[PDB]
Amino acid sequence: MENDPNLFVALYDFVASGDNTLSITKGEKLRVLGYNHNGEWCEAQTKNGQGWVPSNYITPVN
């Protein structure tokens, strides 16, 4: 069976700008799928859906 994913937490609010970005709120948990070519955008999952968020608006959490 596949292991539970490790998670991240949102550091700051980010309002989606369209274009497959995802709004996130400080304190939400996220699962990270990956990053774009320069690492500046992060494709993540939250309770609100899936999409791109700024990579430095999130961080690992135990």
């Binding site: 550091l11 700051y12 980010f14 700008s17 274009d19 497959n20 970005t21 990053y35 774009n36 070519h37 500046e40 955008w41 494709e43 791109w52 968020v53 700024p54 990579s55 430095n56 608006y57």
Partner: peptide
């Protein structure tokens, strides 16, 4: 992912 850069940390 967007072709424009994300906003800087606030």
């Amino acid at each position: 992912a967007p072709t424009y850069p994300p906003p800087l940390p606030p």
